[PDB]
């Protein structure tokens, strides 16, 4: 038998307890970087390897921009939460 909570993967836009940013014109930093990396590496990289490059993207390529000084120049790091028991590839054999 297997546990009832295995093979769950939770991709979070932001670290636990933090703000998650989104651009008013382009869209959220996370879904932005996730779609770029999924479109670019789903042929060749394991899923957790795709999801870490998404982390490097949101962490480094992005920074907030606001007229409110309170919400300006803020960073964001995603958070992978894997209860998976095997690796995940979107290509076959």
């Amino acid at each position: 038998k297997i546990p009832v909570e295995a093979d769950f993967l939770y991709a979070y836009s932001t670290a636990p307890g933090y703000y998650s940013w989104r651009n008013s014109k382009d869209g959220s930093w996370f879904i932005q970087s996730l779609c770029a990396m999924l479109k670019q590496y789903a042929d060749k990289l394991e899923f957790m390897h795709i999801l870490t490059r998404v982390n490097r993207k949101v962490a480094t390529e992005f920074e907030s921009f606001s007229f409110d000084a309170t919400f300006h120049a803020k960073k964001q790091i995603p958070c992978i939460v894997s209860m998976l028991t095997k690796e995940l590839y979107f290509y076959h054999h």
Binding site: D7, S28, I31, K39, L84
Partner: protein, 142 residues
Amino acid sequence: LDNSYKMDYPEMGLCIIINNKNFHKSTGMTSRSGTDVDAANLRETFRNLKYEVRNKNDLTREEIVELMRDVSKEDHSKRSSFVCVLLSHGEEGIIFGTNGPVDLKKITNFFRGDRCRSLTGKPKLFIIQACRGTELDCGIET
């Protein structure tokens, strides 16, 4: 079993995108501008991934629960995985329907091993674009 999940099933599976942009003003939540680009980005990205995508827009918290009860009470037997994409306002463990909060554990528990047996040993992914608090990461320099 294998070193990797079996993905050579008939279907890759269901990809449910839940895109709440407009919220009732009784909540104090504001229009989520730019989410249409995200949801439309996700539909295409998983359309190339051979997923059966289903975009669902401005769903109330009760409509989010009952949809996931219907999705979990499906015969996923022919599907490799289940993807779920939530795009809304958020707290820690809390996702927002357009009229109030849901618990992230409410939604996910519909798909557990003993509840969604068509999806047992099958990768269940959950992508959550939502705040988890109100702490500001200001960064640091290298």
